[PDB]
């Protein structure tokens, strides 16, 4: 039982914080959107007037914020407010470059810091089945584990600061490429006269099998739980995939890496996001049918 | 069951030796003497022309390099075959070619399947090939006792051409995944994320696929992957390039939109100009050619 400041109580933060309260932690919340703050208070978060106040008497500070810029600003606002050697955990999804900058800033203030971005979305968040991909020192992670367990299905140490962000962004780039490639196969099958069911049974039993087909099948019928069967309601929204791909492209640009299919997929998803940011990212299949 | 086996090359030779090993009478033809004589050494009765091999056959299997050769083989032998001979084409050819040769054979009162295969020479030798089959279910049922001794898996895909379509769609995806995995490993390295950590994450997350869990293109995480043995195939760039050409023919013939598969095909056509003999996962080292 530790005291945790939780900054950012939106679609991910609210359920995350609720599980922390359920596990017996004292949770001190801040979010400048009062609706978010109010919903969090209903589940037992003690809500404060400012982020400096929420942080003041905390052993651990979790951030679950929309961008690198917001995390940077938040750190600048609160780090001096925190007690020395408080443990900061950023579970936001932000660029590797931003992650390393904020990490260095936290340490220069005498604070411990990890990046621990997550996968699982809101459903995973509410069920406490999120995967945390953690960058930082192993000993810091050991100190953090009791805080992360109540929110987590999996905790994976990926390397030094920034490696949680790196591993996530690498996986999600691959996933985007796979989701388009699956969609392309299914439309080509359709034009060849190969049924959706038959293609599904082949690919899933063969070398092409992957989550994008076996769980996220972009045509209705073979996997009745996939978004194609429910008007492409997310699931994992195109807006979010497009955000993660922007971060992957930031990583490519910062490294001079060559990612021809990854950047092609980023370009496809940025166009699809303009009009279909609200549909599950499997809905990119629409762009392949005339 | 007497079986005429036309095409006794890298795949045909071991497949035909498995048929002999299962008690079939196997008659053979290949215009390369070394292929033929090698096949005669494991029990195939080799003939001087394909029409000769076919004469006494209940089943005719073709394992040939292109659709045009399969088509010409068919028009050379169909009049030599007995009625209701079962023709199985296990070549990898276009869906269009598959369907035309199927119509040709059935017009002569024959029964015909397309049954291309996955698994390479190793799989052919070990009798673990995956047959992806198009045609009538009642014809596949008749074919089953022949396919079985060559096969680890037999999948009915649909009507004629569905075998070719299924295999070409899966291999297009495979190509895309192998490049995507390679991109991710290079990007991880530049970010200071170790190959082992990326491997541990992706294989336990949504990006997992055979391209990483079995064909990992960096040495270490999967000690048997080609990356740990100078990228010895495995599955050659030559062959992957061939399959992607067929995917591209199918995309062109249908007016399909396949941007990443088409991109993949370009990358592999280019890589095959230099590294045809390497495992297709070696594409990880040609990414800066496209820089
Ligand atoms: N929603 C998902 O499905 C999902 C899944 C995995 C990861 N993520 C990542 O999680 C992060 C947050 O996601 P979300 O869906 O909860 O976003 P959200 O926009 O729903 O919530 C973010 C919250 O942060 C608050 N906030 C902004 N500035 C603040 C500050 N200085 N102090 C305190 N709070 C502040 C906002 O008012 C808002 O309520 C993002 O980085 C996102 O990419 C989201
Ligand atoms: N080698 C592989 O790994 C592999 C794996 C799966 C599928 N395939 C497919 O199998 C087919 C052939 O495979 P392969 O590896 O045996 O190629 P191969 O080129 O080694 O064998 C083809 C053989 O057919 C002979 N031939 C040419 N015309 C002929 C005719 N009219 N009648 C009889 N024989 C003739 C050639 O002399 C040659 O020996 C191709 O369509 C290929 O894509 C190959
Ligand atoms: C994920 C965590 C267990 C906690 C949970 O199941 O919520 C762990 O053991 O790593
Ligand atoms: C078990 C297998 C039959 C092939 C064989 O017997 O080798 C299958 O049914 O696919
Ligand atoms: Mg075709």
Please characterize this protein's 3D structure.
Two copies of one chain form a homodimer. Chain A is an alpha/beta fold and 290 residues long. Chain A has two domains: 1-160, 3-Layer(aba) Sandwich (Rossmann fold), CATH 3.40.50; 161-290, N-(1-d-carboxylethyl)-l-norvaline Dehydrogenase, domain 2. Helix content of chain A is 50%, strand content 14%. Chain A is built from twelve helices and nine strands. The first copy, chain A, has helices spanning 13-22, 34-42, 51-56, 68-78, 96-108, 121-127, 138-148, 163-192, 196-204, 211-214, 238-255, 260-276; strands spanning 3-7, 26-30, 46-47, 60-63, 87-90, 112-115, 118-119, 130-135, 152-159. A six-stranded parallel beta sheet of chain A has the order 3-2-1-4-5-6, with helices on both faces. In chain A, strands 7-8-9 form a three-stranded mixed beta sheet. In chain A, strand 4 (60-63), helix 4 (68-78) and strand 5 form a beta-alpha-beta unit. In chain A, helix 1 packs parallel to helix 6 (121-127), helix 4 packs parallel to helix 5 (96-108) and helix 8 crosses helix 11. Chain A starts with a strand and ends in a 14-residue tail after the last helix. The relative contact order of chain A is 0.09. At the A-B interface, strand 9, helix 8, helix 9, helix 11 and helix 12 of A face strand 9, helix 8, helix 9, helix 11 and helix 12 of B. Residues 128, 149-150, 152-155 of chain A line the site of one (2~{S})-2-methylpentanedioic acid.
């Amino acid at each position: 039982m530790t005291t945790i400041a939780f900054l950012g109580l939106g679609n991910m933060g609210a359920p995350m914080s609720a599980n922390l309260v359920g596990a017996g932690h004292v949770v001190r919340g801040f979010d400048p959107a009062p609706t978010a703050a109010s919903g969090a208070a209903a589940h037992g978060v003690a809500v404060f007037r400012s982020a400096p106040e929420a942080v003041a008497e905390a052993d651990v500070v979790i951030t679950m914020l929309p961008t690198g810029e917001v995390v940077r600003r938040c750190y600048t606002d609160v780090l001096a407010a925190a007690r020395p050697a408080t443990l900061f955990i950023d579970s936001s999804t932000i660029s590797v470059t931003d992650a390393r900058e904020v990490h260095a800033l936290a340490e220069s203030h005498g604070m411990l810091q990890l990046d621990a971005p997550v996968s699982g979305g809101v459903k995973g968040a509410a069920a406490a089945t999120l995967a945390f991909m953690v960058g930082g020192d192993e000993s810091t992670l050991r100190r953090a584990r009791p805080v992360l367990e109540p929110m987590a299905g999996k905790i994976i140490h990926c390397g030094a600061a920034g490696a949680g962000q790196a591993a996530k962004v690498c996986n999600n780039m691959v996933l985007a490429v796979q989701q388009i490639a699956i969609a392309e196969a299914f439309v080509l099958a359709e034009k060849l006269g190969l049924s959706a069911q038959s293609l599904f049974d082949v690919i899933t039993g063969a070398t092409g099998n992957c989550w994008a087909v076996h769980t996220n099948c972009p045509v209705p019928g073979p996997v009745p739980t996939s978004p194609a069967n429910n008007d492409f309601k997310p699931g994992f929204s195109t807006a979010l995939m497009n955000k993660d791909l922007g971060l992957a492209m930031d990583a490519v640009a910062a490294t001079g890496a060559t990612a021809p299919l990854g950047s092609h997929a980023a370009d496809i998803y940025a166009k699809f996001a303009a009009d279909h940011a609200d549909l599950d990212f499997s809905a990119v299949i629409h762009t392949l049918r005339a």
